[PDB]
């Protein structure tokens, strides 16, 4: 994969490549090293509390033929 550096403008620009290749192994050392040293950037950001929207009821049809054909 690409390795990029964060510029002063908060823009990530490629400056290198990670290129690991190995035969028989028990794990990927790159992921272990990155997990141990760096931090994981999760795109999904949970809210302080969940916001329930609605509870809805759906009745499954007796016959699956129309859905199967469509």
């Amino acid at each position: 994969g690409p390795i990029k550096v964060e510029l002063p403008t908060k823009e990530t620009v490629e400056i290198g490549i990670v290129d690991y290749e190995a035969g028989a192994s028990h794990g990927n050392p790159v992921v272990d090293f990155l997990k141990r040293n760096g931090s994981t950037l999760e795109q999904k950001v949970n809210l302080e509390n969940p916001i329930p929207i609605a509870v809805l009821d759906s009745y499954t049809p007796s016959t699956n033929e129309p859905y199967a054909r469509v």
Binding site: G27, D32, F33
Partner: protein, 48 residues
């Protein structure tokens, strides 16, 4: 009264404090770098 200088020529080095700090910094940096590289190589070997 006599002033014996048993300094071993330590006065002749210029900027003795800064030079001593540089020596200690070099030794510490080499030691820490080697220790970190050895630990990471060991962890890579163990995971592989």
């Amino acid at each position: 009264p006599v002033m014996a200088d048993l300094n071993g020529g330590l006065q002749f080095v210029p900027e003795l404090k800064e030079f001593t700090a540089k020596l200690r910094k070099e030794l510490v940096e080499t030691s820490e770098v080697r220790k970190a590289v050895s630990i990471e190589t060991a962890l890579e070997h163990k995971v592989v």
